[PDB]
Scaffold this active site. Structure first.
Site, PDB file in Angstrom:
ATOM      1  CG  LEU A 178      -1.879  -1.129   1.391  1.00 57.93           C
ATOM      2  CD1 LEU A 178      -2.499  -1.067   2.753  1.00 57.93           C
ATOM      3  CD2 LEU A 178      -2.975  -1.136   0.346  1.00 57.93           C
ATOM      4  N   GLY A 179       2.130   1.188   0.293  1.00 52.93           N
ATOM      5  CA  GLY A 179       2.985   2.367   0.355  1.00 52.93           C
ATOM      6  C   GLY A 179       2.974   2.958   1.746  1.00 52.93           C
ATOM      7  N   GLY A 180       4.127   3.442   2.196  1.00 53.17           N
ATOM      8  CA  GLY A 180       4.267   3.928   3.563  1.00 53.17           C
ATOM      9  C   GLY A 180       3.952   5.385   3.795  1.00 53.17           C
ATOM     10  N   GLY A 181       4.469   5.890   4.903  1.00 55.64           N
ATOM     11  CA  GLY A 181       4.337   7.289   5.276  1.00 55.64           C
ATOM     12  C   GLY A 181       5.700   7.945   5.194  1.00 55.64           C
ATOM     13  CB  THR A 182       7.794   9.569   7.846  1.00 57.38           C
ATOM     14  OG1 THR A 182       6.687  10.296   8.382  1.00 57.38           O
ATOM     15  CG2 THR A 182       9.099  10.342   7.993  1.00 57.38           C
ATOM     16  CE1 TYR A 183      10.575   4.700   9.921  1.00 59.02           C
ATOM     17  CE2 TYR A 183      10.787   7.072  10.113  1.00 59.02           C
ATOM     18  CZ  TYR A 183      10.614   5.838  10.707  1.00 59.02           C
ATOM     19  OH  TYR A 183      10.476   5.758  12.075  1.00 59.02           O
ATOM     20  CB  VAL A 229       2.271   0.455   5.072  1.00 60.69           C
ATOM     21  CG1 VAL A 229       1.169  -0.206   5.896  1.00 60.69           C
ATOM     22  CG2 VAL A 229       3.083   1.409   5.939  1.00 60.69           C
ATOM     23  CG  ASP A 242       3.773  14.088   9.694  1.00 64.93           C
ATOM     24  OD1 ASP A 242       3.698  15.196   9.117  1.00 64.93           O
ATOM     25  OD2 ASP A 242       3.946  13.007   9.089  1.00 64.93           O
TER      26      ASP A 242
HETATM   27  C1  LIG Z   1      -1.256   1.843   4.309  1.00 66.61           C
HETATM   28  C2  LIG Z   1      -1.231   3.162   5.053  1.00 66.61           C
HETATM   29  C3  LIG Z   1      -0.439   4.250   4.326  1.00 66.61           C
HETATM   30  C4  LIG Z   1      -1.175   4.762   3.085  1.00 66.61           C
HETATM   31  C5  LIG Z   1      -2.587   5.228   3.450  1.00 66.61           C
HETATM   32  N1  LIG Z   1      -3.340   5.590   2.215  1.00 66.61           N
HETATM   33  C6  LIG Z   1      -3.347   4.151   4.203  1.00 66.61           C
HETATM   34  N2  LIG Z   1      -2.590   3.653   5.357  1.00 66.61           N
HETATM   35  C7  LIG Z   1      -3.293   2.929   6.343  1.00 66.61           C
HETATM   36  N3  LIG Z   1      -4.541   2.532   6.014  1.00 66.61           N
HETATM   37  C8  LIG Z   1      -5.160   1.700   6.862  1.00 66.61           C
HETATM   38  N4  LIG Z   1      -4.717   1.196   8.014  1.00 66.61           N
HETATM   39  C9  LIG Z   1      -3.495   1.650   8.339  1.00 66.61           C
HETATM   40  N5  LIG Z   1      -2.838   1.394   9.506  1.00 66.61           N
HETATM   41  C10 LIG Z   1      -1.679   2.089   9.530  1.00 66.61           C
HETATM   42 CL1  LIG Z   1      -0.694   1.921  10.902  1.00 66.61          CL
HETATM   43  C11 LIG Z   1      -1.541   2.838   8.398  1.00 66.61           C
HETATM   44  C12 LIG Z   1      -0.495   3.873   8.157  1.00 66.61           C
HETATM   45  C13 LIG Z   1      -0.836   5.130   7.656  1.00 66.61           C
HETATM   46  C14 LIG Z   1       0.133   6.112   7.504  1.00 66.61           C
HETATM   47  C15 LIG Z   1       1.449   5.853   7.852  1.00 66.61           C
HETATM   48  C16 LIG Z   1       1.799   4.599   8.349  1.00 66.61           C
HETATM   49  C17 LIG Z   1       3.142   4.347   8.809  1.00 66.61           C
HETATM   50  N6  LIG Z   1       4.195   4.113   9.190  1.00 66.61           N
HETATM   51  C18 LIG Z   1       0.833   3.605   8.482  1.00 66.61           C
HETATM   52  C19 LIG Z   1      -2.716   2.536   7.586  1.00 66.61           C
END
Ligand SMILES: C[C@H]1CC[C@@H](N)CN1c1ncnc2[nH]c(Cl)c(-c3cccc(C#N)c3)c12
Ligand SMILES: C[C@H]1CC[C@@H](N)CN1c1ncnc2[nH]c(Cl)c(-c3cccc(C#N)c3)c12
Lengths: 289, 288
Positions: free
Chosen positions: B19-24, B27, B133
């Protein structure tokens, strides 16, 4: 690293005479011009092609753009076989720490003169948007002409380089609070930190050690953050006039909002007194011999 | 972290999709093999000569958080040169993922979100933590319309950076007190999160944070000026005086006058009687 660098071995123009010591980083060598015999100090730092060049680029930029009688003279830089050599003035008496450990405590008039000369260098640096950040006896040199010159822009360069890196990786700022944006752009403190270091240095010239030198460095740092923090003072009251005690009191103002600037400190009673001339320093140098 | 599992996370979870992460990091949406529950697995590549300080601070922040409004932590796995941090998966993703399909949120939906974020913020600040953040992308919504703060990446990086300051500070005897203070504490406090929530409330209302079309460096420079005016909602008539006041108070330029998260919990906008997850269940129905 420097558009004016010499891609030549400095040993083509200089005889390396001895390793004098070092600064924040690098090794300093006493050197002599092969034909004239003029002495210089050559600061050597290891400089590979992979290394971050920003710190040394900033140190050279500060040295090159400083045109001041109270700042160590800069002659140029050399890059040869992965070694950067910064050529600067060779100050025959060394630092004020080299002086006071042989001579003992400086007199009040000698301290007053050093403080005035340092405040002129600081007023100049601050006017050009620079902060020394490492004011201390070891970084204040006395040349053979009896001049007081600020040296070692290593910490200043490191801090400028760290601030440029932080801005590069600050990321999107649209949700950032203004105070977060301010420490990312300026740093959280300003040039008045140099006024506090001059107050500590004046105590160091009077007592041969900064205050709390025997206290563990981490305890010193933690205590400065505590609420009931009181700044240091001179140990022997009767040895010094009220003008010297007041100079320590105002330079060591805990709040930076009420700490006087370098130009304002130049009109302070201690450094505006009548008998402050280079003769006090030339007499300090005579005592060394 | 001492509690790190030295096993393949695939022994306990089925990886479903990147799904792609956040800061680093990256995921992965994953499924617990025994319960069938979804989890988010953050994967960070490892190299032998890596500084592990930031990663260590993030795990520690997550392991010590125990609050409904912060993503739950389920452990971390180190295997075949990869670190996997296991966290709560929130079915509807982030508020940014939602408003990009749904459009603007209603005032009551924003007021519920703000209350829930302030509950998490008050908890984090009470534990001496700072999110740093807060934004629509970092506020997740689960299938039940509940709110969770996510991505302690920036928070961990800052913590790691501050620990590295304390290590390379040098002799402190000539150092002014304010220099010592920024080296140990940082130059700003947890109240920065209150400002970010104000901007986030505007972002939920207008689909963009204020000055989004202005160059990031120009925005940073404008904020430092002693004449910088805090942002405000564009359409005055579309929102109540209480929402306009919430924005003015959260966006207090001076961090000395900016109210704490606990103080903000008593504000009219978030202490209103009709605020519950049903408002977000309406938002999610609009999505489908
Ligand atoms: C897959 C991530 C990133 C992309 C966003 N579009 C959707 N997002 C999520 N969506 C559903 N459950 C989730 N739980 C957690 Cl934790 C995340 C999350 C979200 C943002 C940063 C990080 C980190 N480090 C993890 C998450
Ligand atoms: C060798 C150094 C350090 C040890 C001290 N005891 C004497 N000192 C000098 N002595 C004679 N001329 C000098 N010129 C210059 Cl510049 C320095 C100097 C002094 C302090 C720091 C740095 C740097 N960066 C350079 C110097």
């Amino acid at each position: 690293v420097d558009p004016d660098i010499f891609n030549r071995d400095p040993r083509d123009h200089y005889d390396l005479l001895q390793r004098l010591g070092g600064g924040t980083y690098g090794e300093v060598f006493k050197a002599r011009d092969k034909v004239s015999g003029d002495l210089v100090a050559l600061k050597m730092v290891k400089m590979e092609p992979d290394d971050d060049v920003s710190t040394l680029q900033k140190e050279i930029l500060i040295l090159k753009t400083c045109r001041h009688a109270n700042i160590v003279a800069y002659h140029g830089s050399y890059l040869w076989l992965q070694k950067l050599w910064i050529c600067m003035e060779f100050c025959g008496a060394g630092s004020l720490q080299d002086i006071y450990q042989v001579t003992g405590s400086l007199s009040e008039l000698q301290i007053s003169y050093v403080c005035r000369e340092v405040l002129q260098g600081l007023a100049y640096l601050h006017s050009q948007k620079k902060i020394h950040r490492d004011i201390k006896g070891a970084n204040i040199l006395i040349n053979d002409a009896g001049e007081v010159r600020l040296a070692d822009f290593g910490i200043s360069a490191q801090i400028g380089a760290e601030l440029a890196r932080r801005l590069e990786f600050i990321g999107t700022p649209y949700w950032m609070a203004p105070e977060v944006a301010a420490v990312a752009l300026k740093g959280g403190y300003n040039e008045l930190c140099d006024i506090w270091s001059l107050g500590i240095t004046a105590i160091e010239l009077a007592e041969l050690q900064p205050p709390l030198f025997d206290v563990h460095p981490l305890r010193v740092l933690f205590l400065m953050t505590k609420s009931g923090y009181q700044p240091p003072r001179l140990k022997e009251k009767g040895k010094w006039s009220a003008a010297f005690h007041n100079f320590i009191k105002v330079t060591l103002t805990k709040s930076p909002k009420k700490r006087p600037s370098a130009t304002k400190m130049l009109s302070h009673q201690l450094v505006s007194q009548p008998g402050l001339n280079r003769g006090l320093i030339l007499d300090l140098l005579d005592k060394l011999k």
